[PDB]
Amino acid sequence: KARPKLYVMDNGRMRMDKNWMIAMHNPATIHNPNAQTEFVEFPIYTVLIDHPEGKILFDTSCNPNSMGPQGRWAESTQQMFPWTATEECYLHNRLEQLKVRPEDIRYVVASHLHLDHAGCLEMFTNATIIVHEDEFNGALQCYARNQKEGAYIWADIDAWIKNNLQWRTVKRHEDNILLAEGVKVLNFGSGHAWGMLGLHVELPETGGIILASDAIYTAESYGPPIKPPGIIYDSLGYMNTVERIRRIAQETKSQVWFGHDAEQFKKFRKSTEGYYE
Amino acid sequence: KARPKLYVMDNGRMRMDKNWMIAMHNPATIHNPNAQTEFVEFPIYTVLIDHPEGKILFDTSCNPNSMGPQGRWAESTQQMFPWTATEECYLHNRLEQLKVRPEDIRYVVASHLHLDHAGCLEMFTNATIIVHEDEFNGALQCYARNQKEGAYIWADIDAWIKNNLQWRTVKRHEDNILLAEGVKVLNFGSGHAWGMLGLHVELPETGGIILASDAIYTAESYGPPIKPPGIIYDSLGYMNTVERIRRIAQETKSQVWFGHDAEQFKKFRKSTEGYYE
Ligand SMILES: CCCCCC(=O)N[C@H]1CCOC1=O
Ligand SMILES: CCCCCC(=O)N[C@H]1CCOC1=O
Ligand SMILES: [Co+2]
Ligand SMILES: [Co+2]
Ligand SMILES: [Fe+3]
Ligand SMILES: [Fe+3]
């Protein structure tokens, strides 16, 4: 039986309007007609599965050259979704401390292609990049239409193409994919974005874990009841996905790891302290 | 050839958070982390078609007993979506000034069953009430689960049932319905709410008119580009509906009358000044 080790890697912090994360979280009233929102902070992280069959990476955080005047992100983007991270937080450094080079990664699973998950895809030229086909198509249209604003970074996409990444698209109606012993890719479909992927991992000692990414921002999103994000591509799809994750967790007695939950993240054992067997 | 007269009836004004009407209209930034929304005012109105084949009413505004301590609307609702109207603004009074009694109405078309469109359904006991089946089912579930908050008013629904209204549901996949010479019901389906209906009218002198209701809040919603509302049941469905309306307007050279557009409403000839032939 395979005895993998799973690492949680801290890739810094982001802030944005709380309305993005929880829609109409604090609506104006007759007694508060100019209601104020908040500017909340949350973690960006990635997960490495050191599996005997090969190393698997879930998400890739933000590109190190995202912020600043010479940054890849448009000015309006930087102001609405600012990212802060020290050098040791960069993905390539986190991996380095584990004695892992990018070239050692067999599979990268991209939950979706937003700026905070697909930032460092270009690094893994020796891997197969697993992504939802609808998410891929949508991003490429953004590129082709020369969209310089939004959550799809023109400069990042440019780099993927130039670096000749090897893509494996998950089809709209494609089943879950067994990646390795006790590791399965979940096809969540349209919701938060054009197409979302998750991961289910079964560890001998710790048991089952579901990586939900932005299918579920936080425990507050999860509920119940469900509290959806401010902007959504497919509201119906989003609601269905959350409830599907809940069912899976119950039936397999698995933990659910959210995309950007500050409190949950504090509890994790990170790559600087150890791993999950 | 039939020569109808179409009347626009002013049924008062409402206010709410602008984020309801235009999602993320003013997002927080690093420089404005506690961004403020606004509390915007907009008209509630209904349309009467005095047709030789019979009188047709589109929407019914709010119930006269909605607001106040003894009001049908929950406190939280009254504070988030306050309605103001004088006595002459009440639907029953507007009709009276045209020498029209509720019993004279042959057809009522309910665009949807929100508090500001289905308020006075209970009045028209001599009419056939045309509504989307999915919208009807959803409202009845709110009632059955004893939901006392939200945009579906428990007390309003209660009254419909007690007054023994005569329902004709539009099926999910049912075609447009010819109601009378030059009057057609449009099935928009799920979007803003569970199920939306519109109307297309062809007048000898004025030409074509599309009544969109909450399928399109305002000219700003309409664009292009489309700016969706803060909360939506079916985002995908909503976007599709707007574009469908644009196509119809172009192909038939029809004006589009929005649900709650203050500027457009000012330009209408109201029932106090005349009608459209
Ligand atoms: C459609 C999803 C909302 C678009 C804005 C965005 O990309 N926001 C990031 C921030 C953390 O996770 C997110 O989705
Ligand atoms: C579809 C969610 C409803 C948001 C609150 C609401 O019901 N607002 C009114 C005001 C005019 O049209 C509406 O739907
Ligand atoms: Co995202
Ligand atoms: Co409505
Ligand atoms: Fe994210
Ligand atoms: Fe409305």
Side-chain angles (χ1 to χ4, degrees):
Chain A
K1 161 144 81 164
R3 297 282 187 178
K5 299 182 201 288
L6 179 154
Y7 302 81
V8 176
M9 294 175 294
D10 187 337
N11 296 129
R13 308 281 178 279
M14 183 176 285
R15 291 167 292 152
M16 70 185 176
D17 189 334
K18 188 185 168 62
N19 274 142
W20 292 118
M21 212 169 68
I22 308 285
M24 307 297 314
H25 80 96
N26 177 45
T29 57
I30 202 177
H31 292 131
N32 187 200
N34 299 299
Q36 277 170 35
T37 184
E38 293 101 53
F39 206 62
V40 295
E41 183 182 58
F42 53 90
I44 315 290
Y45 76 97
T46 54
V47 174
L48 173 77
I49 308 90
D50 187 12
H51 200 286
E53 295 182 42
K55 291 173 172 58
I56 301 161
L57 182 64
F58 182 82
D59 281 352
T60 69
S61 69
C62 309
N63 195 85
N65 188 41
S66 299
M67 300 285 294
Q70 268 56 50
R72 281 185 181 180
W73 298 359
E75 188 51 41
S76 59
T77 302
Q78 296 196 32
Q79 294 209 207
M80 277 193 296
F81 309 99
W83 180 51
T84 64
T86 60
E87 219 156 14
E88 66 199 316
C89 277
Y90 298 158
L91 177 61
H92 66 95
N93 291 337
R94 285 301 186 197
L95 288 179
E96 179 180 349
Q97 276 306 112
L98 298 178
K99 283 205 198 193
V100 175
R101 295 162 301 173
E103 70 189 316
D104 294 334
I105 305 300
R106 191 186 179 194
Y107 296 115
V108 180
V109 180
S111 64
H112 59 308
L113 294 180
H114 276 164
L115 64 176
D116 51 314
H117 299 261
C120 293
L121 279 182
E122 63 195 76
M123 274 175 45
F124 305 104
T125 49
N126 197 34
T128 304
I129 313 300
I130 307 170
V131 67
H132 199 289
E133 76 173 343
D134 288 324
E135 187 70 2
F136 196 43
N137 290 343
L140 295 176
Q141 276 208 34
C142 288
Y143 183 78
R145 296 173 182 259
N146 287 297
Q147 178 72 232
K148 289 298 198 289
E149 280 170 337
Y152 295 93
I153 309 307
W154 198 92
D156 282 357
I157 301 160
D158 197 59
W160 307 339
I161 299 173
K162 281 171 174 168
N163 282 10
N164 188 33
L165 295 184
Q166 299 304 297
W167 300 94
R168 200 289 200 198
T169 56
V170 183
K171 306 307 178 289
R172 188 177 287 177
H173 303 299
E174 184 172 356
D175 288 353
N176 301 157
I177 306 164
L178 179 68
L179 212 51
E181 187 181 351
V183 177
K184 171 195 296 185
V185 180
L186 309 174
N187 182 3
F188 291 144
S190 61
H192 169 72
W194 289 304
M196 309 291 294
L197 301 178
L199 208 71
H200 192 291
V201 180
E202 184 70 39
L203 296 172
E205 184 178 299
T206 75
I209 300 166
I210 296 166
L211 306 180
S213 185
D214 282 3
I216 318 175
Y217 272 156
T218 74
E220 188 186 353
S221 311
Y222 195 45
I226 303 168
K227 287 166 105 177
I231 286 297
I232 212 160
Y233 168 66
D234 175 12
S235 55
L236 291 186
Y238 171 88
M239 297 301 289
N240 292 324
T241 290
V242 177
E243 284 306 339
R244 171 179 167 198
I245 288 163
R246 195 188 313 283
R247 170 186 59 76
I248 294 173
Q250 173 251 331
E251 287 177 359
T252 66
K253 301 220 270 279
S254 299
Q255 309 170 41
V256 176
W257 292 10
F258 308 118
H260 303 295
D261 191 314
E263 292 192 9
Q264 182 181 55
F265 182 81
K266 277 205 248 295
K267 284 185 163 63
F268 292 147
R269 187 162 61 243
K270 330 283 191 308
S271 55
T272 43
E273 279 193 335
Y275 40 71
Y276 297 83
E277 286 184 4
Chain B
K1 159 185 266 60
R3 281 181 140 59
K5 300 204 212 297
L6 178 155
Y7 301 83
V8 177
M9 295 176 294
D10 186 338
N11 297 133
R13 306 282 179 279
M14 181 175 286
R15 292 171 295 154
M16 71 186 170
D17 189 335
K18 190 181 165 60
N19 278 138
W20 291 116
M21 215 164 64
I22 306 282
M24 304 300 309
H25 81 96
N26 180 47
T29 53
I30 197 174
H31 291 116
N32 190 196
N34 295 312
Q36 272 170 32
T37 184
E38 333 171 18
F39 209 58
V40 296
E41 185 183 65
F42 55 91
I44 313 294
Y45 77 98
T46 54
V47 175
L48 170 76
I49 302 89
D50 186 11
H51 201 286
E53 297 181 41
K55 288 166 172 58
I56 302 162
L57 185 65
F58 183 84
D59 278 351
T60 70
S61 67
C62 309
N63 191 97
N65 187 38
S66 298
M67 298 287 295
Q70 270 61 55
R72 283 182 181 181
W73 293 8
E75 186 53 38
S76 61
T77 302
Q78 291 195 39
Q79 297 208 198
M80 278 194 292
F81 308 99
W83 179 52
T84 63
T86 60
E87 213 164 349
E88 59 199 301
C89 277
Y90 295 159
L91 178 58
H92 67 94
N93 291 338
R94 285 298 186 198
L95 287 176
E96 187 170 19
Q97 280 307 118
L98 297 181
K99 289 196 184 303
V100 178
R101 300 162 302 169
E103 51 165 346
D104 294 333
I105 305 296
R106 186 185 179 192
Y107 296 114
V108 177
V109 181
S111 66
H112 59 308
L113 292 180
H114 276 164
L115 64 179
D116 54 313
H117 297 262
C120 293
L121 278 182
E122 56 190 282
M123 274 175 47
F124 307 100
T125 46
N126 200 28
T128 304
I129 313 295
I130 304 166
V131 65
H132 199 288
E133 74 170 340
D134 289 321
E135 186 72 1
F136 196 43
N137 289 343
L140 294 178
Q141 275 207 36
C142 290
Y143 181 78
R145 296 171 182 256
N146 287 300
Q147 229 285 57
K148 288 304 197 293
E149 282 174 338
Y152 296 91
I153 307 306
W154 198 92
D156 280 0
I157 300 159
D158 195 58
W160 308 339
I161 299 174
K162 280 168 182 174
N163 281 3
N164 194 34
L165 294 185
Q166 297 304 293
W167 301 93
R168 198 284 198 206
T169 56
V170 180
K171 305 306 175 287
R172 190 176 285 179
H173 301 298
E174 184 173 354
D175 292 356
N176 304 154
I177 306 162
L178 178 70
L179 211 53
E181 187 178 352
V183 180
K184 196 167 76 176
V185 179
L186 307 171
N187 182 359
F188 293 146
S190 62
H192 168 71
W194 289 307
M196 310 290 297
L197 298 180
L199 208 74
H200 186 279
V201 182
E202 187 70 40
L203 297 170
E205 171 183 320
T206 304
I209 300 163
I210 295 165
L211 304 182
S213 188
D214 280 3
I216 315 170
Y217 271 155
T218 72
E220 183 182 4
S221 305
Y222 193 45
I226 304 166
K227 289 164 95 171
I231 193 41
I232 216 141
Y233 168 65
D234 173 12
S235 57
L236 289 190
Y238 170 87
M239 297 299 290
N240 291 338
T241 290
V242 176
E243 284 309 335
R244 175 184 166 191
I245 288 162
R246 198 186 314 282
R247 168 182 60 76
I248 299 177
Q250 176 248 326
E251 283 175 4
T252 66
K253 298 210 285 277
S254 299
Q255 311 168 41
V256 175
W257 290 10
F258 306 117
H260 304 296
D261 188 313
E263 297 195 7
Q264 179 180 61
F265 185 75
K266 283 200 76 72
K267 298 205 184 80
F268 290 146
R269 255 205 309 282
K270 323 294 196 310
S271 53
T272 39
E273 290 202 320
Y275 40 74
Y276 296 85
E277 284 183 8

